[PDB]
Structure formats: C-alpha cells, structure tokens
C-alpha cells in the first residue's frame, strides 16, 4: 500500500537530513550554482593548497572518510529492519557498503571541475588532482562516475532511498540471514521507485537507469581498492605515527 | 501505450528465437528428466571424455563456440529497432562491449550446479570435471557457474531474456561513444518493455525488474575477472592461439 511507502520515504530523507551534514542541496548552491554570503577557498595549485601535499592530501581523504563510515552507521541504523538483523550481518553490511556509499555521496560534492571539501568551506580543482604522483589517479575515475550521475538530477530525498538500498545489498560475502535483507531491500526499492515516479515525472525510466548505475560504482571501488594496495607498495615504515595508523 | 510495448516484446522474441539456435526452452528440456530422446552423454573425467576429444583443447573449442554466439548476437542485435540507424562506430562499440555480458547470461540457461550442456545439448560436462583442469583452466569456468546459479533463480523465460539482451546492448554508458542520446533513446523503449513483460509474465514476483537489473553488476564483475585470466594464460601459453575477432574485442 502506498501509504507506508511513502511514509518510509519521508522517514529516509529527514533521517538523511540529520545523519549528513552537507546535503545535496546546499553542495549544489555553492558549487557553480552561486550565491552571496560566502564563496569558499579555491585550491587550484601548490601554493593555493599549501597545507602540505599529496601524501598528507590523501591522509586527509582518510580523515574525511572513517568520519563518513560513521555518518552513514548512524543512517543504517535508521532504516527500518535493519537493527533486527543478526549483528554479524549489519558489520558485514557496512563493511562492504561504506565504499559505495562514499563515492555516491562524493558525486553530491563534485561538478565537473572539482570537489567541495573540509565541510565545503573549500573547493580542490580536478585539476590540480590530476597534477600529483602515483596519487594524481586516485579522485580521476571518481570525477568520471560524478559527471555521469549528476546527470540524472537525483535530489536529496532519492538519494535517501538509493542509499539505503545500497546497504541492504543481499549479495555481501559471508551473510548468514540473507532472507530478511532481500525483504528489506525489496521494500525500499519499491519506495524508490514510487519516489522517483512522483518527483520526476517526465523522466522515464530514471528508477531503470539509477540501478544501472551501480554496475559503474562496484567497478570503481574494485579499481579505487586495488589501487590502495599499490601505495601500500611505497609508503610503508616508521611508525612513530602509531595508533592513528591503527585507527585506519 | 502498452500496444506497442507488447508487439516490440513479441518482435525482439521472435528474433531472438531466430537468432539463437539454443533456447532456454529445450536446454531446460534437455536437463532435467522431461524428453529422452534428448538425454545429453555426460562427461565428468577423462575416460568419458575421450568419448570425445584436454585442457587446451577445451579451451579452443570454447573459443570457437564464442565466435559463434558473436556471429548470433550480431544478428539479433540488427533486428533491434533503431540499432542499425546509428553511427556505424557506435553500432560496433554497443557489440564490443555487449557481447560478452550476453554471452554469461545466456550460458547461464545452458547450466545448472552440476555442469553445463556444450555441442548444441548433445553433451554436458561435469562442473567438478571442468573445475579439475590444469592450474589456470580450472578457474576458467567456475565463477560462470556461480553466477548462473543465482541467475538461474530469477527463473526467467526466452520472452524475458529476449528484452533484457537487447537492453544489454543498447548501454550507452559504453567507453568512446560518439552519439549517446539516440542510444539512451532506444534503451528507454526496450526498458518500458522489459518492465511490462515481467509484470506480465512473473505477476507475483515482487521488484523482478529491480532485481534482474542489479544482475548486470554481476556480469561486468564476471567480464573483469576473465579479462584478468586472459592476461595470465596468454603468458603462461605462449604456443596457444587466441581467434583474432576475440582479441578485436578485448582491450
Ligand atoms: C548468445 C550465445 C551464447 C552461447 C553460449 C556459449 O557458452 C560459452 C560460455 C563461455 C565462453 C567463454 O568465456 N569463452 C572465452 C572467451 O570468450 N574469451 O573472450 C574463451 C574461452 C574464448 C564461451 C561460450
């Protein structure tokens, strides 16, 4: 029935709004969309950043991402069902989903020449990305998945609902109740689905051509953890950096 | 209208049935009990085998059938509506890049957990016989199985498969295409009737649509990991010839 389907839709978005500081929507009005009150510092160049670079811009990444995994624990938890799942599956459901999760609501951030950072107070150029070491690869492919999801104009309160699909996958390795997650999933797909219909009504198709969109991202976590494992072919010793290492 | 998105899921149908001489249909009709007058030879090691004809040799065989189901899917993908009018670059990068998803899903119809059917049905090899090949053969095959398994319980007709193949084909999120929009056009149409054919075809099962959508995560994973094979036993196989029209598609 399409009361408790939109009930679980607005139930997604506010706890979105809560569990995520940057929305979608203030992302897009300080990105090339303007507005007056204030601009944030542009990083475009080696002097423009100078905070140190390349190793300690990715150890930042790092910083900014264990910060995420916890935004997007806090929004599982939200989701209906999904604290009464054995607690071995919610480990492994965000364990495999963070990833995706992350560079979904990384595209929030990016246009087509760069990305919001630090709370958005900041925008690093694509380009001065591209100009680093073995680390110039990194945000590149990201940049690429970014311009072709923002094309489908999704809004904060969709991609409440994709998120939340996303997380209650079904196909993670080592799942020991896999039943009631599919349950799940199959509810919030249905939300999307209404969601999307009535947010977007003459984009056809638009339900179709988001999940097609995942077979992008899994493709792109593939690449982007395989190419962790290369810097941790350079960097390696001297640990007077200790636990912050173990916090990684 | 739902008019004419029925009459393009009984024309894509039609071609299909057309183009592929080895339907869901009589696989299923050669697997389980059903006909025996269709009952397969089986082989499962290398005596039954020799019933017959190793390793690299089943190798190539399998080379040749893939140039084959090339050749098939070539011509299904002409009958697709639209897909001939395109950019004659674009027409061949939609086939470069959707052969092999096609190729995984439809070997799926020819499995189940215990092996697969190979010459046109008349044989099955064993999985645990094709899974016991020498060193990088015996990785060949078995995540295909896997897959197989899991999208074999959609449980999915030729009428479905039919749309969805076509819905493969006409991607245009593809590498290097030159026109996208009239691609995404033809697509939206062959997704409208996927999505009616399976409300009509499966009433009772919930999200099929979704579900069947998710799987094509699941092929681009299968298609990375056996390029990645590929790299390693074109190495260790310096004498082993690969056909020339395969290494056109691979990059
Ligand atoms: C639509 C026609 C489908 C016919 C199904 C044939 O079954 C298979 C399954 C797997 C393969 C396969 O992976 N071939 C490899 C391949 O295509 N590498 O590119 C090698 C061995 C040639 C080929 C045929």
Redesign the interface.
Known sequence: ESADLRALAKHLYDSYIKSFPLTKAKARAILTGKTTDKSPFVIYDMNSLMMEVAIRIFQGCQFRSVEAVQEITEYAKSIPGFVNLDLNDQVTLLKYGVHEIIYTMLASLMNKDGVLISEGQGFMTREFLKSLKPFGDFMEPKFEFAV?FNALELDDSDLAIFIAVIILSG?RPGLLNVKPIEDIQ?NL??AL?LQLKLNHPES??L??KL??K???L??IV?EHVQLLQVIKKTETDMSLHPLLQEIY
């Open positions: 072709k196909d199959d797909l249905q689905e056809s198709q339900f179709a999940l097609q995942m077979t992008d899994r493709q593939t």
